[PDB]
């Protein structure tokens, strides 16, 4: 769906923060205990060219830490998660030093499982980054969007 061209996996490595997120269905992010309300923390590239991901998400009245592996495919900036439903991740854009934009969908239902996020290197609000995020979203069927504050980023599961 018009994603970034070639991506330098080696440079997206390091710490990140989930500044803002959006989804095609409200239920996807509505309520903190959402199925797609995840928070990226670390991106660790593997030797085989894959990308390990350290993240947090609500699960039965408790924030849980999880390590996911997005396997690179025969498509530029598109990886795949071996988890059920076959969630696909697409890197829309990134400057490597400040922001990164991606979306994730489940092949099973590529209509009611499209979530996108705007990541950043420092726990600050990057207005210009959000800008590119809003711009890249005006063409998607998002029916819910959230944006966080520096203080909210201080929470494993965001205040």
């Amino acid at each position, epitope marked *: 769906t018009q994603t970034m061209k070639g991506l330098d996996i080696q440079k997206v490595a390091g*710490t990140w*923060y989930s500044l803002a997120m959006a989804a095609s269905d409200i239920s996807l992010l509505d309520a903190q205990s959402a199925p797609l309300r995840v928070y990226v*923390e*670390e991106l*660790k590239p593997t030797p085989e060219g894959d990308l390990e991901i*350290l993240l947090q998400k609500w699960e039965n009245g408790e924030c*849980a*830490q*999880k*390590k996911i592996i997005a396997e690179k495919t025969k498509i530029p900036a598109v990886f795949k998660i071996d988890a059920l439903n076959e969630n696909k991740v697409l890197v829309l854009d990134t400057d490597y030093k400040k922001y990164l934009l991606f979306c994730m969908e489940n092949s099973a239902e590529p209509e009611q499982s499209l979530a996108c996020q705007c990541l950043v290197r*420092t*726990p*600050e609000v990057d207005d210009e980054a959000l800008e590119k995020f809003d711009k890249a979203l005006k063409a998607l069927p998002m029916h819910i969007r959230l944006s966080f504050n*520096p*203080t909210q*980023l*201080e*929470e*494993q599961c965001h205040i």
Partner: antibody, heavy 121, light 108 residues
């Protein structure tokens, strides 16, 4: 340039109170959660209290809650620890540690040498 | 309170062999475990976090693995300066707990 220097430690009498301060440098202080870890003479590490980057979120250990108060000053890059009504069990080397993220992350990539607090009469 | 038990408490290995320290939690703690290194009168150093993520500036010979309840810190090419006390710490729930620690001296 990145380092953590704690100070304030010394001899303190049972029941009295002392203030420990930790000076940071080489990184952006408000962007990291800070924590205090201590070590009693010839004993293992023990987590004391934690604080987020903003400092609006703090956490203490039961053995010190109500007596110790953690605080931070994002202007002078200083991390504080207020020890009130000190018991003998508080004798230890108080270490200053920096969290990887803005919140009390749980793991700390930067530590200081620590300051020895001896509570006796 | 989650109780972290390290093992062995002390070890002696010749510079060069690979060493392995184990750490077990009193309950599942996901992959939220870290490994610190502390030397006499020096500032502890973070080696591993998230069970297997290697802190920047730490030699690749240090590795970490494990999940659920059992975790392990491995040191490949043991060096003469790898001598120290290693501690594991969990951050799944409060209070955050440390392991009694493992003291590693260099065989010589």
């Amino acid at each position: 340039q990145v380092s953590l220097r704690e100070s304030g430690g010394g001899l303190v009498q049972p029941g009295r109170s002392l203030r420990l301060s930790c000076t940071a440098s080489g990184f952006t202080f408000r962007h990291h959660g800070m924590t205090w870890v201590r070590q009693a003479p010839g004993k293992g590490l023990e987590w004391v209290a934690s604080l987020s980057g903003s400092g609006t979120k703090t956490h203490f250990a039961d053995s010190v809650k109500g007596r110790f108060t953690i605080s931070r000053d994002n202007s002078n890059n200083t991390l504080y620890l207020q020890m009130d009504n000190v018991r003998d069990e508080d004798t230890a080397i108080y270490y200053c540690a920096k969290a990887k993220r803005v919140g009390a992350t749980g793991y700390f990539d930067l530590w200081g040498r620590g300051t020895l607090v001896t509570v006796s009469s | 309170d989650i109780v972290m038990t390290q093992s062995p408490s002390s070890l002696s290995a010749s510079v060069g062999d690979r060493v392995t320290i184990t750490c077990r939690a009193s309950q599942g703690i996901s992959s939220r475990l870290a490994w610190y290194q502390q030397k006499p009168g020096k500032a502890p150093k973070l080696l591993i976090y998230a069970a297997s993520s290697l802190q920047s500036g730490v030699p690749s010979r240090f590795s970490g693995s494990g999940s659920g309840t059992e975790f392990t810190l491995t040191i490949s090419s043991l060096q003469p300066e790898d001598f120290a006390t290693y501690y594991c710490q969990q951050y799944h729930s409060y209070p955050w707990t440390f392991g009694q620690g493992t003291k590693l001296e260099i065989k010589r």
